[PDB]
Design a protein around this ligand. Sequence first.
Ligand SMILES: Cc1cc2nc3c(=O)[nH]c(=O)nc-3n(C[C@H](O)[C@H](O)[C@H](O)COP(=O)(O)OP(=O)(O)OC[C@H]3O[C@@H](n4cnc5c(N)ncnc54)[C@H](O)[C@@H]3O)c2cc1C
Ligand SMILES: Cc1cc2nc3c(=O)[nH]c(=O)nc-3n(C[C@H](O)[C@H](O)[C@H](O)COP(=O)(O)OP(=O)(O)OC[C@H]3O[C@@H](n4cnc5c(N)ncnc54)[C@H](O)[C@@H]3O)c2cc1C
Lengths: 498, 503
Amino acid sequence: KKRVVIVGGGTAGWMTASYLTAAFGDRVDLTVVESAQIGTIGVGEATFSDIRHFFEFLRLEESDWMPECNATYKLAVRFENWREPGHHFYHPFEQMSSVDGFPLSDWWLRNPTTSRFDKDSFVMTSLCDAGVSPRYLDGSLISTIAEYQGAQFPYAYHFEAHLLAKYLTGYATRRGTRHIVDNVVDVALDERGWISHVRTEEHGDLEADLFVDCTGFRGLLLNKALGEPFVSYQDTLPNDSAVALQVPEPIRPCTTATAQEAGWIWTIPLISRVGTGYVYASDYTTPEQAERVLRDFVGPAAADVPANHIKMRIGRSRRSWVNNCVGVGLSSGFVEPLESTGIFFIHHAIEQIVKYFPSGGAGDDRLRELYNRSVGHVMDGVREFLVLHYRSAKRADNQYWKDTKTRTVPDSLAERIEFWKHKVPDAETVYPYYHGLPPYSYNCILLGMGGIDVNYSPALDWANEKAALAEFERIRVKAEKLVQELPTQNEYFAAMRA
Amino acid sequence: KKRVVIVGGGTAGWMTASYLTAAFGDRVDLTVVESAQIGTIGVGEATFSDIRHFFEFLRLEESDWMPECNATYKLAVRFENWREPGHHFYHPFEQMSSVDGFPLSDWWLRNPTTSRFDKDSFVMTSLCDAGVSPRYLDGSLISTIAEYQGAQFPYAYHFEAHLLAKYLTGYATRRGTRHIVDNVVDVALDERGWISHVRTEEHGDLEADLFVDCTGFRGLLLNKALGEPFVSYQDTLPNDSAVALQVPLDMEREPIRPCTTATAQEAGWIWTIPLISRVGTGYVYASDYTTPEQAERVLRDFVGPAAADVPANHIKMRIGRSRRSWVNNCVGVGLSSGFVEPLESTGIFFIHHAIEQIVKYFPSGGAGDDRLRELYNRSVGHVMDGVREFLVLHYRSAKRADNQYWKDTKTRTVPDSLAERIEFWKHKVPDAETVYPYYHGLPPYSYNCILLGMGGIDVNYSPALDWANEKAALAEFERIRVKAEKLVQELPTQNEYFAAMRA
Ligand SMILES: Cc1cc2nc3c(=O)[nH]c(=O)nc-3n(C[C@H](O)[C@H](O)[C@H](O)COP(=O)(O)OP(=O)(O)OC[C@H]3O[C@@H](n4cnc5c(N)ncnc54)[C@H](O)[C@@H]3O)c2cc1C
Ligand SMILES: Cc1cc2nc3c(=O)[nH]c(=O)nc-3n(C[C@H](O)[C@H](O)[C@H](O)COP(=O)(O)OP(=O)(O)OC[C@H]3O[C@@H](n4cnc5c(N)ncnc54)[C@H](O)[C@@H]3O)c2cc1C
């Protein structure tokens, strides 16, 4: 009978408790200890293509939780002004078809229907441009995380972080999770360096077979108590700061990432407000200037809203599971939210905690090794993907954007980029370990950002293009039909609440 | 405009010609040169989970080609006597379900319904045991190769190799392939080491933008002319020889079993490939442990009196792969590129993958061509290296240890990465995280089937399954059991199915 103690009551702590509750029911003992004094990070409002697995694993329907979390649909990230002023493109959550053995991006490079690869190749692009729900009013859409990401439309969500945490708190406590409001004030280690207990101020000492560090950037257990080194990603991704605001027509079904002079601004539309933030590199602009740029970007509704200034710890713990302690969430690592991967890292982590859950006996070192390899691959792969956003962005208007082309690139990515100049990204040339990103994602960024010239495959000069023309026409016909038929998110969620 | 000259008219040459015809039509000029005097290898009659992509790419229906090739269905490989005498198990061409994030093999280890993982977890196992067709008499089953292998039932075929070659010859020649029957007697190189032409005995010199070496083990262009080194796999897979028979049988006497059988022997294993009118059979063996004469005797004894007066085909195998399969303007396809023993019938898979990749990385003649060749070589090298690991696992996990040969399977070299995987697999059944990470045509369920069937390595179920609710897993095992018992009562035999196809 295993006991798990989760330290931290942010999104990471309550996702962990709820997921473990859904996986193990009352057969594993779960305790969350969270501080009333120490706040959560206060952001984290957009998700990634994994996310439908999480809510379905909890056996929750969208109507169960979306109204309570002011949640909306996220069908894509909309990138504005990365290639050039006034240009936008999408990374949509939608599989890219292959025709006669070549991805649609290859055919598009040879014979584009329009100048917009995303518009020609994915229906979700038109839904985002039109501002419609992916689901009809009758509810219809137009087991592992990986399998859910393989769905035709593996869409995601926007939500209020605090409301999701409160929702998941009720979900987990109603299903047996013990909820302690207290500070962990000491982490006691035994002679072999394992955690023997966490000491609280008022609830005594908590023992467990597994301690989950969900304490955020501070990494109280994994980093402080166990001394696990942290590996910076700042050589390749200099953005180290953010300033965020919550500020009270069709709701656009995507996150917007609008490139700025020293970083980029997110727009996350919720049911009753917008979450917004400027992620920036402090070497290139000040917190004062970044807040000014953000408030100016939002406009007069951002006048007297309080700013949340955040210094980010960018990188990952060398190992996320050390002895009897596993870091989940910001304690394990973090990269800038350009593709909204933080909750994906949490979700992946907790799926892997279940997968590699220890017995207490033989094999546990190998299970921990596999766990650590899996989470390290996800973060290292995503880091490559994020670097590609900056390395392929065409804009070069100032020192910041010029430096994206000269700074460190992971060596393996540099080689992939050289291949991608003549073969569009595919399974052979993408980071080969699971990191949540199928090849179409790389295609969307590479072609959208527009800074690297990509050649279509010479074979397409001799292949008959009839099937490819037919597939582009099918997508165009479907997109124009869907845009006329689907309701807005406003109407959809009004009916859901009703 | 572009010119491709294919040297060799075995399975590799005509698969290449027909595939390029289907990919490019008449927009590329194709020539096959093949020797009337140098025969083909004379074996290669079972295929792999990739294969339905090939025929569909050529826009062929099963009724178009199967009767002409005396073809049958291959739903699995049946491994006999590898674990222990009298034991069999399958590697079936059927996806393995996962329940609540764990593969069915994990749940089976915790709570097996029967002692047979393959019977409990795959419907195709029962079809093979029962000897029935995967398709009803009405034809119903119960764009890239990888996507075809992802089908629920990515089944394969048996066929007469020479009849398939003849069929593909007609297919390609009727669609514009020039067919030269002649010997290539010289391969001339230009100053930069590229092939300038191939000289034939009677048809002059042939130039091309791309030469495809389909000359078999001899590798006339890739290994001889261009000097490309060959990398032996014999450290890990010692089987180096084969003796084969084609045995006519009244295959209408009894149901044709829808699988290849691999029956372990004292110094290797014997294949049985059932066709419409005969059986292809052969003994793959290690020459250090038995002689050709003893191997032929064992094979003839295994087949029985129907092998009387049937001539034996003794084959020395070249086991390994070319260091690079595409060098300058020459790409090796088939045995010229590499070979591993046919334990999982992967040779035609290698050809099929190679020709798909030839189309994928087809050169322009200009910038980028070195990178395209690099990607091609990496892709085919990963396929062969991954399949090598998978084959080694058959021997490394086989329980039988009754003689020196089978004892030596446990002490022989194992690729270091596979040795590490095996240590993980003792506590986590194979999955995407632990299997060879590059495409090699083998999803994780394949590793599970071999690991659990061979029975020589103890595997523990995941500790999490002690706390996970097993209702959904029991429901899935029951669903498979119910479906399998229904299907075996309803499906026709292959005999009936193909009799109606011919009608
Ligand atoms: C600027 C920014 C933008 C982001 N945008 C996104 C996005 O769009 N999408 C996304 O998915 N993710 C996003 N993320 C990531 C996301 O915020 C985190 O992945 C997620 O919120 C989980 O945070 P956490 O629970 O790990 O840490 P926190 O929110 O910091 O929670 C830490 C918890 O530990 C508790 N704690 C700390 N010390 C103690 C102690 N001694 N005793 C008891 N309790 C203690 C605290 O009280 C708190 O409950 C963003 C992050 C940042 C910084
Ligand atoms: C024992 C054994 C069992 C096998 N079993 C299977 C199996 O079950 N499944 C499977 O998929 N694969 C199997 N394989 C592999 C299979 O045989 C090959 O994948 C396939 O037959 C392709 O052979 P090839 O065309 O490359 O060579 P070959 O059949 O040797 O053909 C070579 C061709 O090149 C020609 N040639 C050679 N030199 C010259 C010259 N100078 N001029 C002109 N022409 C020339 C020959 O005449 C011939 O046409 C097996 C192989 C062996 C050895």
